[PDB]
Amino acid sequence: MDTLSFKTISANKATVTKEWVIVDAEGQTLGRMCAKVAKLLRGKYKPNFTPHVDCGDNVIVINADKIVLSGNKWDGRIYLRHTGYPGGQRQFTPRDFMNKGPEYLFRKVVKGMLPKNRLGAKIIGNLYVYAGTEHKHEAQQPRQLDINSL
Amino acid sequence: MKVRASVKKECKIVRRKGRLYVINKKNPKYKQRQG
Amino acid sequence: MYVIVDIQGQQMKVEQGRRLFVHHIKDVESGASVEFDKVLLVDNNGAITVGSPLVEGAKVVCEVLTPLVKGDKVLIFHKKRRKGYRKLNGHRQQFTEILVKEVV
Amino acid sequence: MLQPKKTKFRRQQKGRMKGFAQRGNQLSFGSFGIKSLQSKWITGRQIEAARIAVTRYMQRQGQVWVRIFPDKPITKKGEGVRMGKGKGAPEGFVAPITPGRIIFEVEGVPYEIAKEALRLAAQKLPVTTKFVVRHDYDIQN
Amino acid sequence: GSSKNGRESESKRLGVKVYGGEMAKAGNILVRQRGTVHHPGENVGIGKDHTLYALKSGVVVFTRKKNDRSYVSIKTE
Amino acid sequence: AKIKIQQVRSRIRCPKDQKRTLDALGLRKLNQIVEHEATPSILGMVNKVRHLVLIV
RNA sequence: UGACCGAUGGAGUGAGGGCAUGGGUGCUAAGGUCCAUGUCCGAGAGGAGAAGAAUCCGGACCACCGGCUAAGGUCCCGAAAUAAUUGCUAAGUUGAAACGAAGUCAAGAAUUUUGGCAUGGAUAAUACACGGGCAUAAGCAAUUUACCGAAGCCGUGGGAUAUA
Ligand SMILES: [K+]
Ligand SMILES: [K+]
Ligand SMILES: [Mg+2]
Ligand SMILES: [Mg+2]
Ligand SMILES: [Mg+2]
Ligand SMILES: [Mg+2]
Ligand SMILES: [Mg+2]
Ligand SMILES: [Mg+2]
Ligand SMILES: [Mg+2]
Ligand SMILES: [Mg+2]
Ligand SMILES: [Mg+2]
Ligand SMILES: [Mg+2]
Ligand SMILES: [Mg+2]
Ligand code: NA
Known part of the structure; x- marks a missing residue:
């Protein structure tokens, strides 16, 4: 039987407050912007944050190609991967990711600041990265947000 | 061209691409690398 | 109207006629009137007062419904592997149930 | 070899060099x-290598002094010899030195190439060295 | 190889048993020594193995004199 | 006169003479306060366990 | 403090180990070996260090959806400052030596010394590391204030064992 009578309430699928926000990447640093984006996606800015529920915001990033990498990171940061075959290690750069597309670079950075579980694998799908300032997300009425305020 | 841990100096000491060189165009047998 | 007040060393949010369980109060009877006057916050349907040295004049009067409510049994187990040491006890926490009559 | 002709005991315990030289x-x-x-x-x-290096330079003027003498005997076990069963075979003598101890010194010589002869001697030693001059020496001889 | 060493004898537990300022009784052993490292004085005897002992009760006194010779005596009454 | 000594650090890994000094002062728990006359012997104990106590 | 000493009933142990200090031995090698003085693991859970028997903090009677701290921390994974102020580093250094330029700042003396931070020396075999993302500070050095942080301390409820 329950002798507590004063509990903390967890949010659930029917009680979360999910919103669409738009942030800009005009001159921000890649890691410093992506940490704030990870906090937005996880829902650390909501007073009803619940670590076992998708309670964050759907984030649209515009002007993704204007992001800034300081130092020699654009070609001096060596990402390594493996194909699974002998002699199968490969190298690539943030420049290679940017050439492929800005969404791939942003997804790679944000996955790594997100939790490593099923919930984080679900959360990463709430992020939308676009190269220019033109995107098509009507019927949801996204709200502009100043990322420098956060 | 000779590469050695300690290079020393009309030869002139220059730094190129993070490496140390001692060059002498008058006498090319005195070039050195990796100071 | 709700107040934030502590009862037996734990802060609770309480309204009128709530039927709380609190830590055991010794030497009480059914229907006995208990008093708790250490309110930290009062929220009167819009007007909120916060007390550093508590809220002056605030007060919660309750009546005891059950003088001894035991909680669910918990098994307490100690074991150190490969050493042979092992013991298993039982524990039941002790509560009293009160009903809040007036919230001043 | 530079070593004493006689010693009271053939063996010596490995001591502990502690601080700076006070003499x-x-x-x-x-x-x-x-x-x-x-x-x-x-x-x-x-020591002999350093003295030969310092005396090949400087021609033959001036004077050269070595101020440490090796008198501590050391041993070594050998190949395939296990631990224990006493001390090993003799392997010569060593001199224990601490920081601040003067090894080599020269006199009657110009400063500008005394500085070079002593560096040549110091390159053949297992310790880092420091050049020192007398605190009454003047530039004009 | 082999070692030609490995021998020792048992330690003889020598030294000062009663220090200056302590109270001693007659017959108490004061000093165990090899040779007269300390010498007898007033009311202190010396045995076959140069052991210093108290002839009377009292307080042990250690005193030094010329040649830095140390004497052990008992101060009674 | 009377001074107040409060234990602020643990006795774990301290030598037995220091542990026995803490016992002689009367400190057996962390954040415990004892009150003693400021005699030279008490001051000597405090000096011996200075790295574990605070004068409050 | 309280368990020091006597006399009596019952034992177990008599394969130890790591670290620090003083030494012997060894090669001033070994996660080596032999002693001495402490300490911890043994027989000891909890916190930080990514993950570690004995390194740093700390000795667990039970419960609690209460509070304060220790070591160590406060951009995200991950709790708490994208806090404030002053400098240094441009190497992603960062989060091993003789021996060489001296890249750079600073303090001097009559070319020259002096320290701070870097740089070359610097090196093998399944794929690689600041734990990872990543960072020009979120690096290094100094100072100040808040805050996080343990089964340590306090609070509340409940037991047990002794000395008075
Ligand atoms: K590590
Ligand atoms: K955090
Ligand atoms: Mg003997
Ligand atoms: Mg045996
Ligand atoms: Mg044994
Ligand atoms: Mg060992
Ligand atoms: Mg060792
Ligand atoms: Mg055992
Ligand atoms: Mg123990
Ligand atoms: Mg631990
Ligand atoms: Mg706090
Ligand atoms: Mg806690
Ligand atoms: Mg406790
Ligand atoms: Na022996």
Whole structure:
């Protein structure tokens, strides 16, 4: 039987407050912007944050190609991967990711600041990265947000 | 061209691409690398 | 109207006629009137007062419904592997149930 | 070899070099010299190599003094010999030195190439060194 | 190889048993020594193995004299 | 006169003479306060366990 | 403090180990070996260090959806400052030596010394590391204030074992 009578309430699928926000990447640093984006996606800015529920915001990033990498990171940061075959290690750069597309670079950075579980694998799908300032997300009425305020 | 841990100096000491060189165009047998 | 007040060393949010369980109060009877006057916050349907040295004049009067409510049994187990040491006890926490009559 | 002709005991316990030299740290008998900045055992082979290096230079003027003498015997076990069963075979003598001790010194020589002869001697030693000059020496001889 | 060493004898537990300022009784052993490292004085005897002992009760006194010779005596009454 | 000594650090890994000094002062728990006359012997104990106590 | 000493009933142990200090031995080698003085693991859970028997903090009677701290921390994974102020580093250094330029700042003396931070020396075999993302500070050095942080301390409820 329950002798507590004063509990903390967890949010659930029917009680979360999910919103669409738009942030800009005009001159921000890649890691410093992506940490704030990870906090937005996880829902650390909501007073009803619940670590076992998708309670964050759907984030649209515009002007993704204007992001800034300081130092020699654009070609001096060596990402390594493996194909699974002998002699199968490969190298690539943030420049290679940017050439492929800005969404791939942003997804790679944000996955790594997100939790490593099923919930984080679900959360990463709430992020939308676009190269220019033109995107098509009507019927949801996204709200502009100043990322420098956060 | 000779590469050695300690290079020393009309030869002139220059730094190129993070490496140390001692060059002498008058006498090319005195070039050195990796100071 | 709700107040934030502590009862037996734990802060609770309480309204009128709530039927709380609190830590055991010794030497009480059914229907006995208990008093708790250490309110930290009062929220009167819009007007909120916060007390550093508590809220002056605030007060919660309750009546005891059950003088001894035991909680669910918990098994307490100690074991150190490969050493042979092992013991298993039982524990039941002790509560009293009160009903809040007036919230001043 | 540079070693005593006789010793009372053939064996010696490996001591412990502790601090800085409190004697033999000032320049007597000479003008220029080198001090050691580290604590180490110095072998007679190293000493003879350093003296030969310092005396091949400088021609034959001036005077050269070595101020440490190796008198501590050391042993070595051998190949395939296990631990225990007493001390090993003799392997010569060493001199234990501490920081601040003057090894080599020279006199009657111009400063500008005494500085070079002593560096040549110091390159054949297992310790880092420091060049020192007398505190009354003047530039004009 | 082999070692030609490895021998020792049992330690003889020598030294001062009663220090200056302590109270001693007659017959108490004061000093165990090899040779007269300390010498007898007033009311202190010396045995076959140069052991110093108290002839009377009292307080042990250690005193030094010329040649830095040390004497042990008992101060009674 | 009376001074107040409060234990602020643990006795774990301290030598037995220091542990026995803490016992002689009367400190057996962390954040415990004892009150003693400031005699030279008490001051000597405090000096011995200075790295574990605070004068409050 | 309280368990020091006597006399009596019952034992177990008599394969130890790591770290620090003083030494012997060894090669001033070994996660080596032999002693001495402490301490911890043994027989000891909890916190930080990514993950570690004995390194740093700390000795667990039970419960609690209460509070304060220790070591160590406060951009995200991950709790708490994208806090404030002053400098240094441009190497992603960062989060091993003789021996060489001296890249750079600073303090001097009559070319020269002096320290701070970097740089070359610097090196093998399944794929690689600041734990990872990543960072020009979120690096290094100094100072100040808040805050996080343990089964340590306090609070509340409940037991047990002794000395008075
Ligand atoms: K590590
Ligand atoms: K955090
Ligand atoms: Mg003997
Ligand atoms: Mg045996
Ligand atoms: Mg044994
Ligand atoms: Mg061992
Ligand atoms: Mg060792
Ligand atoms: Mg055992
Ligand atoms: Mg223990
Ligand atoms: Mg631990
Ligand atoms: Mg706090
Ligand atoms: Mg806690
Ligand atoms: Mg406790
Ligand atoms: Na022996």
